[PDB]
Subunit: 230 residues, 2 copies
């Protein structure tokens, strides 16, 4: 009659801190888990409730706990861009280079969602800017696929390989072309991106732009390829 | 020479320069290497009065460049609403298609311009363009994380399960690009989580392949919720 764990989980999932503390006082398991192995700390991390995280951490919750797919609280906090929560977690034991079951690091997630400042912070505290799972998508790949311009500038300025390959031979210029990000394509061309690169199936960025219905981008790629009078 | 100077003048908004060059006898329908006209450039840059001028001075409103794009396409791409109204009111075709079947609505959706999409739909645009053979407006909005715009399109009966040429559905696109809240939304509205693309991959598979473990978790919870 007393499944207190799922109640605590639901309170953490919905930001209701007072209920979480009441249940904790009554003696709810601070390390309770849902079906995918997610703990209240994981949820406090995604929702960005800092003080709740402090409380859980001091009351004994495990900071390097991994859910079923190998995600840590740091991963989730990084996904939602909560800077001070990231700082706190780092300052009390979390591994900055933690890896999930497919080789993805927190920096990857910060890059994917366009959190520029958090990326700067992670890089200054030792994150690997060219972290591929072994060979997989790089942070720059993630930034390029989702159109995050300033972040691309930052990563390139911190010497990310502008021509790195993922598992399918794709470059960042491929990703940007496939998603129809015009200003980003211009930026990558301006910084020396390889316009003739072919993926594992022989496709150029131009080919992908056509395949995905982005004909303005395709235009730009064609002028880029042919612009030399003599 | 006069053609390129007229082109650069249109591309840079200098209207007085445009009329001087026209009087000097520049072809009002001149074309660069990708077939783009001064009207095209005025359209992409959102120079309304210039567009009115060129239109009064004889410019062709339905001219197509090298890939079949019209002035309306560029205006829709860059979100210039009032310019779109003006073009529509003097002859422009609302459902024009370029060489791969993409319409102005596709581009307005891809770039997240909510009001302009609302307007295009009010003026007769086809919400299900290339349904079930190629990318639809919903594909484009979903691939780039535009939540509100996806809500709008679904409310006006966009096909939530349409497949593009590679068998991909919108839920595929959202999963592979890691748009979490959009995946949740698509799940709530009946997207098929067991849909398989041309390579047999489900949205869950794509999420794994693209290093998106949070999206995969949500898909796992849905999958085990309705084991039906």
């Amino acid at each position: 009659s007393m499944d207190i764990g799922k109640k605590l989980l639901e309170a953490a999932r919905a930001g209701h801190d007072d209920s979480v503390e009441v249940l904790l006082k009554k003696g709810a398991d601070i390390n309770a888990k849902d079906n995918v192995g997610v703990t209240p700390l994981h949820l406090a991390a995604v929702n960005g409730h800092l003080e709740l995280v402090k409380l859980l951490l001091e009351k004994g919750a495990d900071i390097n706990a991994t859910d079923l797919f190998g995600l840590t609280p740091l991963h989730f906090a990084a996904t939602n861009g909560h800077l001070e929560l990231v700082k706190l977690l780092l300052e009390k034991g979390a591994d900055i280079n933690a890896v999930d079951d497919v080789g993805v690091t927190p920096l990857h997630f910060a890059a994917r969602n366009g959190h520029l400042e958090l990326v700067k912070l992670l890089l200054e505290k030792g994150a690997d800017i060219n972290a591929m799972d072994m060979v997989g998508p790089t942070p720059l790949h993630f930034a390029a696929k989702n159109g995050h311009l300033e972040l691309v500038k930052l990563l390139l300025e911190k010497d990310a390989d502008i021509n790195a390959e993922d598992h399918f031979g794709s470059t960042p210029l491929h990703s940007a072309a496939e998603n129809g990000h015009l200003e980003l394509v211009k930026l990558l061309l301006e910084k020396g991106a390889d316009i003739n690169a072919r993926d594992k199936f022989g496709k150029t960025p131009f080919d992908l732009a056509i395949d995905n219905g982005n004909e303005d981008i395709a235009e730009v790629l064609q002028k880029a390829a042919r612009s030399h009078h003599h």
